[PDB]
Structures are given as structure tokens and as C-alpha cells.
């Protein structure tokens, strides 16, 4: 309220309205997200939005996830105070600017995404909306951060039959049956993400292309990378790699450190 100073609006959309801000007590940069109460389909716990439940569960120390520093309730909205890296650029803008990414950069990014998703999973949290728009690059440190847990859920081992993340990243089993399990669905979205990184765009726009699962490469991409991608994008959920299999894949060997990454690629 007076505990933060509000700057420019960063973005608005189905995640709410996020402003650039500064914590007055110690000038920490922050991002202040406002979500309207009647836009919240999903609540946990007094009653908070699921997004706050999920962020509290993952906001312990390891930094591949955006940290929730505080939250407030207002009469028609909740306000979430989040970390803000500075300078920062979301992966989607970064890809718009730079086109398809060199493999070495896509490997570093993709690895950090996997560490972040493993950490969420370990904390009992399923993101359900992994995509370039939901990933922030701290451009000085070369560290990626997962944001926008507003479509996530507690991780469980039984089937999910609800989804509200991004359709073009949702797996064929969700398209056809409205059913998925959390890990394998997460893995498919990671396949879409990785294709997006290396080709400069997502592979499928239409339901039919998702269902068909046939991957055409429009950029030059190494065989090992194409094979990882096709593996993550297996039609049968149980034919997809576990996180361990993805990180042990030959295309994932020799990842740059985040800091090396920023020096080489983010200048
Ligand atoms: O959640 C965020 C945290 C930090 C920054 Cl810089 C931005 C966001 C953000 C921007 C759109 N959704 N979430």
C-alpha cells in the first residue's frame, strides 16, 4: 500500500495485471500482480487463490521459480508481491527478437526449465502452463524463472480432467479425452517449448496437428535435438521421457552454467 512503490504496468492478460514495483523498506525490485476475485476459479487454504497455495509451496530457496514474497487480500482482488529480476525479458519476447535459438543456448535454457519444473514437482506442485511466455530470463545472471502458476494444481498421481493452461501446449490426450496425468502432460509441453526454442515457433497451431503429433522441422536442428523433441512429443503419455530421462539424454550433456550462458549469449 505504502509498503511498495508502483511503477509501469508490465502486462495484463489471463494472469491479471502485473506492475513493476519497488519494495520501499529495502528498494528490492518487485512485480505486483493483481488478480480479480471473480476471475479465480480455484481456491485453497482462510481461503486464498490456489496460485498463492502453489507459490508458498515452491517459494523455498531454489530460484528457478519466481518467489512469492508476500500477498494481500483486497475486497475484490488479491495482490501478490513477487520477485522481479532486473533487467528481465520473457522467453517469448526474446524468441520474437532473436528468432530460433542456437542449440547451446536452447540447451542451457531448457535445462534450467527442467530443474525448475522438478523443483515444483518435488514441492507437490504441477504448473500446467509451461510455455515461453511463462518463463523469465534474468538477462544478467542468465537464470530462467517460471512464472504464472495460476493454472497449476497440487501434484497428484491420479488423472486430471480439468485444464485451463495454453491449448497449443496441451497434449493430445487432453485434446481427445479431456484427461491427462501431470508428469506426462508436463513433459509434452516441454517438447513444445523445446521445439519453440530451436525453431523460433511452436510446432502445432491446430487440434488436428496436435492429435497427429507429426513434427516437421523448419529450421536446421541436430538429430539429437529432434530426437529429444520427438520423444517428449510421443503420442502415448507413457512413451514420453521422465525428467531424469530428459536430463540424461545425449542432447542435454555439457550444459552451460547460467552465468556462462549470459556472458556468451546474452552479452
Ligand atoms: O509474475 C511475474 C514476476 C516478475 C515479473 Cl518481471 C513479471 C511477472 C509476470 C508478468 C506477467 N505475468 N507475471
Domain boundary among 86, 112, 140: 86
Beta strands in the chain (DSSP E): 4-13, 16-23, 28-36, 43-44, 48-49, 68-73, 77-83, 88-90, 125-126, 135-138, 143-146, 153-154
- CA dist 188 and 186 (Å) reads 5
| CATH code for the domain of 31 | 3.30.200.20
Listed resolution, Å: 2.2
Annotated binding site for ATP: 10-18, 33, 83, 90
Together in a domain, 21 and 103: no
223: number of Cβ within 10 Å: 9
d(C-alpha 189, C-alpha 196), whole Å? 10
CATH number at residue 127: 1.10.510.10
Contact 83, 239 (CB under 8 A): no
> What domain range includes position 229?
87-267
Q: Which of 28, 64, 82 to mutate to test the pocket of ligand 1 (most atoms within 8 A of CB)?
A: 82
- State the Cα–Cα distance between residues 52 and 138, nearest whole angstrom: 23
For the chain, the C-alpha Rg in angstroms (whole number) is 18
Experimental approach: X-ray
Place of cell 526454442: 197
CA distances (Å), 177 to each of 36, 128, 203, 239, in order? 31, 17, 21, 18
Who's near 258: CB < 8 A, 6+ residues apart?
A: 108, 112, 141, 142, 143, 144
Split into its structural domains, the chain has a count of 2
For residue 79, give the 3-state DSSP assignment: strand
- Give the separation between CA 89 and CA 8, rounded to whole angstroms: 15
Residues 167 and 192 in one domain: yes
Query: Which residues does ligand 1 sit against, CB inside 6 Å?
Result: 10-11, 15, 18, 31, 33, 66, 82, 84, 88, 136, 147-148
Q: Are residues 164 and 199 in the same domain?
A: yes
Amino acid at each position: 500500500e505504502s509498503q511498495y512503490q508502483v511503477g509501469p504496468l508490465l502486462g495484463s492478460g489471463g494472469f491479471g495485471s502485473v506492475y513493476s514495483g519497488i519494495r520501499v523498506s529495502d528498494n528490492l525490485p518487485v512485480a505486483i500482480k493483481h488478480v480479480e476475485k471473480d476471475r479465480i476459479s480455484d481456491w485453497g487454504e482462510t481461503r486464498v487463490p490456489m496460485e498463492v497455495v502453489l507459490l508458498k509451496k515452491v517459494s523455498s530457496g531454489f530460484s528457478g521459480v519466481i518467489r512469492l514474497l508476500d500477498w494481500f487480500e483486497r475486497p475484490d482482488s488479491f495482490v501478490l508481491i513477487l520477485e522481479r529480476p532486473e533487467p528481465v525479458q520473457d522467453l517469448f519476447d526474446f524468441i520474437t527478437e532473436r528468432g530460433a535459438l542456437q542449440e547451446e543456448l536452447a540447451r542451457s535454457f531448457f535445462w534450467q526449465v527442467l530443474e525448475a519444473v522438478r523443483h515444483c514437482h518435488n514441492c507437490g506442485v504441477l504448473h500446467r502452463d509451461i510455455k515461453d511466455e511463462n518463463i523469465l530470463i534474468d538477462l544478467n545472471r542468465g537464470e530462467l524463472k517460471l512464472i504464472d502458476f495460476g493454472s497449476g494444481a497440487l501434484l497428484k498421481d491420479t488423472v486430471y480432467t480439468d485444464f485451463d493452461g495454453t491449448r497449443v501446449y496441451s497434449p493430445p490426450e487432453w485434446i481427445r479425452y479431456h484427461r491427462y496425468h501431470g508428469r506426462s502432460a508436463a513433459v509434452w509441453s516441454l517438447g513444445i517449448l523445446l521445439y519453440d526454442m530451436v525453431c523460433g515457433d511452436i510446432p502445432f497451431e491446430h487440434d488436428e496437428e496436435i492429435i497427429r503429433g507429426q513434427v516437421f522441422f523448419r529450421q536446421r536442428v541436430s538429430s539429437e535435438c529432434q530426437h529429444l523433441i520427438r520423444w517428449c512429443l510421443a503420442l502415448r503419455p507413457s512413451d514420453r521421457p521422465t525428467f531424469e530421462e530428459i536430463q540424461n539424454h545425449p542432447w542435454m550433456q555439457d550444459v552451460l552454467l547460467p552465468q556462462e550462458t549470459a556472458e556468451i549469449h546474452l552479452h
